[PDB]
Amino acid sequence: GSSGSSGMASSVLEMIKEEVTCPICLELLKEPVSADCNHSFCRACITLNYESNRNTDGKGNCPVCRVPYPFGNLKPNLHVANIVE
């Protein structure tokens, strides 16, 4: 036979997932907060979204699943770590 080749260095960046990103602003979640519906949003977004769209009853609605979640009961999604067992 007869053939040859050389070295090649070509990598790719992280594939911006269109699932984790904020379903509202579609940008890096800044100090987001998880919700009952395992849905987190920009500390601000979540706040505004609620104000703009709220239920006369008192609670609001998720801009993704539209589920009634108790405001304030939001956990910080900043310490997103697991391997730290």
| Residue ranges binding Zn ion (CB under 5 A) | 22, 24-25, 37, 39, 42, 45, 62, 64-65
Q: Which residue has the tokens 């008192």?
A: 58
Closest distance between Zn ion and the C-beta of residue 59, in Å?
13
Cβ distance to Zn ion smaller for residue 51 or 85: 51
The phi, psi pair for 45, rounded to 5°, reads -40, -65
Helices in 1-85 by DSSP H: which ranges? 43-52
Smallest distance, Å, CB 24 to Zn ion?
4
Radius of gyration of the chain (CA): 20
**Minimum distance from residue 3 beta carbon to Zn ion (Å):** 53
